[PDB]
Curated annotation (Swiss-Prot), chain A:
Highest taxon in the source lineage: Eukaryota
Organism for this UniProt entry: Homo sapiens
Subunit description: Interacts with PCSK9. Interacts with MTTP. Interacts with AUP1. Interacts with CIDEB.
Part of the whole protein covered: 4420 to 4467 of 4563
Protein name: Apolipoprotein B-100
Gene name of the encoded protein: APOB
Glycan-linked positions: 12
Length: 48, 48, 48
């Protein structure tokens, strides 16, 4: 009984915590797209 | 005077930076090199 | 041609295949945990 009780919680927390990696990967994908995009403009305002 | 001159020069050179960004995008697209290959192949045929 | 092809392939793979691999890992983890629970239940029954 203790083993089953531990297994259910372990699986639930594994599934829940493991899903956070995908969100961080999506943020990294956004950063990758941003770098693929060329910057422009805002530098002049900052230097002024 | 020094600050004014520096800002002027930076703003002047900001444009060519964006032109180079466009050229870099074209290069990543690999659309400006095949012509050089064709030219060198033609020269090779002529020399041969 | 193949340079641009591989560039596009990597750009697609980073944003598409990586989350799927993470999901595969998560699913395998949960499945193995549940199978572990089943096997330990059987072994404990036999021991009892």
């Amino acid at each position: 009984d203790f083993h089953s009780e531990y297994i259910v919680s372990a699986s639930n927390f594994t599934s829940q915590l493991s899903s956070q990696v995908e969100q961080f990967l999506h943020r990294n994908i956004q950063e990758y797209l941003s770098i693929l995009t060329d910057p422009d403009g805002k530098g002049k305002e900052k230097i002024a | 005077k020094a600050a004014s001159g520096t800002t002027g020069t930076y703003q002047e050179w900001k444009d060519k930076a964006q032109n180079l960004y466009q050229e870099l995008l074209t290069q990543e697209g690999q659309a400006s090199f095949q012509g050089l290959k064709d030219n060198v192949f033609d020269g090779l045929v002529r020399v041969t | 041609y193949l340079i641009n092809y591989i560039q596009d392939e990597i750009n697609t793979i980073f944003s598409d295949y990586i989350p799927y691999v993470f999901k595969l890992l998560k699913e395998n983890l949960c499945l193995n945990l549940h199978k572990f629970n089943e096997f330990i239940q059987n072994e404990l029954q036999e021991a009892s």
